[model samples]
Target: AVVASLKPLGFIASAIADGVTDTQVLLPDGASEHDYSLRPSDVKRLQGADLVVWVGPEMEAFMEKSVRNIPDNKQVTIAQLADVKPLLMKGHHGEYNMHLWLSPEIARATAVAIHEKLVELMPQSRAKLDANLKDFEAQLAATDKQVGNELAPLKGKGYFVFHDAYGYYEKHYGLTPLGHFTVNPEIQPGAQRLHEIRTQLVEQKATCVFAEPQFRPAVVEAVARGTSVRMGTLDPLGTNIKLGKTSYSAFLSQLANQYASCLKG
Candidate 1:
């Protein structure tokens, strides 16, 4: 493949595990796979690709219909992650947060799976693939430790989320993120609900109201405007990661820094 695939962090994890390198990623950086519309050039690239890979239909509903236009038997999905044991649903509405690769452990497992698959598919490049995956695993282990060390001081610090997107992040980092203020991104909290959340924040003295860039910040802003509690954006997707986030380690490290800045102040 001329370019690396964009936004399937799990697939990327797998590719790195198999030692696949030098692929160019075509899509725009930090593209929301759920809402991304394929460009004409993207279609052209798909045609030229020896093989294409993507996340499964459940996680990436946006890419489902698009895959049909691509040639048959030339694509792959890592649905096995869920096939063994699906992740639990979050919140009252129970929306599945598909950013699974944000967790180092999951990413490592994915990379291993991918590495084995690539070796099976292209045995000739097994040596190169083995070396690359080995490097990825080593790097990921160190990165995981680095993230833990950075977040250690913040452990058990109670916080709030915009839409409960950080279960995996919190689980991995030992954070105490309370439930979401809004289950649906577009739905505004009722006055009573807002009042209730405000009351809770006041009581807990939540250090920061953690959120992502996918939704508006105004809703969170309004809730935190009068309170002493601060607001911070903890984008696990790593918005700037496209340019500077070279690896899994950097992504978590940046998030830790962003959260620390907002929460500490």
Candidate 2:
């Protein structure tokens, strides 16, 4: 079986593992990837898996120690892949943003990496893996163009996001993100922090302020209160979407819809 570090990654893994092997995600429902404590069962799962896929230490520090136990040949680090390296964007704390799965380009790259590893592990299943990869690529290309057209009208529509998770997606779609409020989603910034952000939102007249599905704090409402900035939510993790071959595309489309839903008004 193959295992992914998170749900969005699982969407990619499931696509490649389809008909070849089973797949699982390490992060549980509604859990934050930033600071999740590993369980003993998860350790067993990792140790037993034929292949493991993750973004690497830059994104999930919590998994680093555990992942160390797995052999290098059995794992795929997308962030460090030569092909994916050029597309990397700098993060607040790391060399690059760890959310590579958000970009359709990165997603395709990731699928290739996963397919190669799966083929190496199970040579007899190469034909099915090859077919799955082709289907995923074709499906993703169509979805990417469709999403681009869907988001085209809002090209310069300004907005603020609670966290910096959407940099890859926002940049890919040419979505005008005026700025981000915080890097962490669990803790809200102080009252003084909110005051400063509110000032910018008003002056810039941002069309919306988006929060994550995992953390819809009242602070989001308080910040957008009494302002023209409409409030919206973004789910980078694909928490609500079912895991499947097409879930990643659906997640991208869902995010665009979330933006269009608020920005349209």
Candidate 3:
């Protein structure tokens, strides 16, 4: 079995390991990666898994210690992978944005890496792994083009996200993001930040304000009260997307639609 730290990563792993092995996600649905604590069963699963996939300690700090106990050969850290490191977008305070699973290009690179790891683990399943990767690449190419078309008209349509989690996806598609309420969702946005967002809402500078399904605080509603700005939901974790070969593309398409639904008005 291959255990992924988050659902998005598991979706990618499921694509690559489609017929070869089962893939599991450590972070349950409706959980925030920023605030997850590993249970004993999760640790046991990690230790017993044939392979583990995660974005590295920077993004999933909760898994750092547990994964350390697993051998290096058994884990693939997507963000730390050499090919992916250069593609990381800058986040607030100079840290690299660790939402690697959101970018289609990065997700492709991750799929290749996972395929390589799985091939190494189960050389007997090389044929299945090769076919799975080829199919994933083709599907991803189609999905990427479709999403580009869907979001083309929404460019320069200003908005603010609840947190600074969509930089890779937004920058990839040239979407205009005014700002975020906070960098980390667990920490509430300060009064000054709320005032600034409220001011933008009043001035009609933003068309939408997006809150993640995992971290929709009252503050988001309070700030949008009495404003014309529409409220939208962005699920960075793909909480509702099922794990399957086609799930990665489904997740991206869902996110694209989420943006269009609110910004089109």
Candidate 4:
């Protein structure tokens, strides 16, 4: 069995692991990466898996200790890879952003890396693996172009998210992200700053105020309350996506639509 930390990662792994073995995501569809605490059952899943794929310690702190029990040879850490390291974005808390999977280029790198590891473990299935990887790359390139074209017209429109989780995606597509809502620890603004944010929203300046799929978004809603800002949702984890060969592209396409649906006139 193969397991990935989140849905988006699982989406990539599922394509590579297809017909080779079963795949699962450590964090369930409804769980948020920022605050998911693993249960005893999760430990069983971790221990039983033949291979695991995850971002790193910072992104999935909940799995850091558990992954220790799994041998290094049996797990692939995307953040530590030489090819992936350079593409990483710098985070205020660390040297790199943990949301590397959001960028299409990084996702392509990740798919290649996962394919290599799977080939090493199951060399007998090389032919199928090679074919799957090629198909994914071609499909992804086409999807990337389609999404780019779809979003090109909305380039200058500014928006805000509940947190700084979308930098990779936003920067990749050149989307204008005005700012994120005040998030304590990451960011905590005072009353004066809150008033300024409300002022911006009331003026209909921020075309959208995005919330995540796994959370109630009370804080985001509270801040945008009584404003003209059109509410939007972003599921970085691809919660509603079913794992398959086309899942990674589907995840990105769905996200592009989510942004377009709210921000577009």
Candidate 5:
């Protein structure tokens, strides 16, 4: 239903978008499934959809009130990420983390669930879907391998960013993030917090500290003044300009290369 699926099922969507006999995903820049207030057109989109995939009400909290505004009971609100444990406190404000696609395993599980739901919707294409699923899984495995090969060199190399959004990436790639600017993105660090981060950086021998697209560079810049660590952007957004559909792969590759080279530099 939105671009959030790109992280979890980009490969699957890429493979199936053209191949699916009767189904295709709609995508556009900032087509975020998160935090959207639906217009009547959105309601119309769901009114006719054979199946509507979403992460669920809790994750897309803004959609919680809005999703009910739609009248369709037939559309599949397939929580591809359903039935799992949650590390609730490790997230942003309120209760849960919306960034579940940060984990490649979650991506894998989501792909499987989506593929199955797809199969149920278009059972005639099971063989094709199965074949595509194999192909997609293999493709993502290759991507995972590429990330490992590319980023493993930066293993244990410390960096810091403004958000705790990199947990799944760190778990996947073994990259050592020293810590975050703040767990709550809205909150700025006080002087004591700055002093703490500074000492932590020096003691940890951090090679670099990162800036996220969501935060103020000026704030990071001021905090990082006189530090030995090089400053650079660490994108959780991965908003590739040329970063079109193919850019998901490019985004990851670029991030790995950027971190590797930036840390070394």
Candidate 6:
């Protein structure tokens, strides 16, 4: 069995491990990646898994201590992989944007890395792993083209998000992001920041404002009050999507629809 720290990662792992091994996610649906505590059962599961996948301590801080005792050969840290490091984008405060699962490009890199690690662990499953990786890559390529076409029309349409989690996706699709209310969802936007967002809303500079399912604070609604901008929800975690062989493509397609539904007008 394989254990992934987040749902999107699980989605990718599920595709690679299809018919070879089982994949489980540590963070449940609707849980914030920035804030979470591991349960005893989760620790036991990690201890018993054949392979574990996580971004890094910066993204899943909750798993930092739990995975310490796990052997190095059994873990694949996506953020530290050589193929993924060059593709990382910059975030606020000089930190790298740890919301890597949102980028299709990064997800491909992660899938490749996971395939390699799994092959190393179970050499007997090489044939199945090779087939799964090839299938995932072909599917990802098709989905990338479809998503690009869907978002091309909304390129210049401006919008604001609840948090700074969509940078990778936004940049990849060439969407116009006005800015985010806050860098970290756990913290509230200050009066000055709110004033800036409200000013943009009043000027009709943005066509929409997006809120996350995990952190839908009143501040988002309060800031958009009296403005004509439409309110939309963006689920970074893919909470409603079930994990399976085709789930990664489904996740990206759902995100494209989420952005299109609001910014199309």
In model 6, state the lDDT of residue 228: 81
List the candidates' TM-scores in order.
0.76, 0.94, 0.92, 0.90, 0.74, 0.92
- lDDT (0 to 1) per candidate: 0.62, 0.85, 0.87, 0.83, 0.59, 0.87
lDDT of 5 by residue, 121-202 (tens): 6788788878866765676677789988888778778888766667777777888887776633335578788788878777
Ranking the candidates on TM-score from highest down gives 2, 3, 6, 4, 1, 5
Question: For model 3, how does the per-residue alpha-carbon lDDT over 49-84 read when each residue is reduced to its tens digit?
Answer: 999999987888888999888877789999888898
Q: Is candidate 1 or candidate 2 better by TM-score?
A: 2
Q: For residues 28-49, what per-residue lDDT tens digits would candidate 4 score against the true structure?
A: 7666675699998887888888
Q: Write down the worst ten-residue block by lDDT for model 4.
A: 181-190
Candidate 4, superposed: residue stretches over 4 Å from native: 183-194, 202-204, 214-222
Question: Candidate 2 residues 1-265, lDDT tens each?
Answer: 8888999999998988887788899998877676788898987888899898889887877788998888877998888788998898874376678878888899999999999988988999999999999989988999999989999899889999877888888889988999888734556567788788889999998999988877647667778888888988987887888877788778888988988998885
RMSD value for candidate 3: 2.4
Off by over 4 Å in 3: 92-94, 183-194, 215-219
Model 5, residue 146: distance off in Å is 1.7
List the lowest-lDDT window of 10 residues for candidate 1. Answer: 84-93
- Looking at candidate 6, the ten consecutive residues that score lowest on lDDT are 180-189
Counting clashing residue pairs in each candidate, in order, gives: 5, 0, 0, 0, 0, 0
Q: Provide the global lDDT of candidate 4 against the true structure.
A: 0.83
Best to worst by lDDT, what's the order? 6, 3, 2, 4, 1, 5
> Candidate 1: global Cα-lDDT?
0.62
In model 5, where do residues sit more than 4 Å from their true spots? 1-12, 21-36, 66-91, 94-98, 183-196, 214-216, 241-251
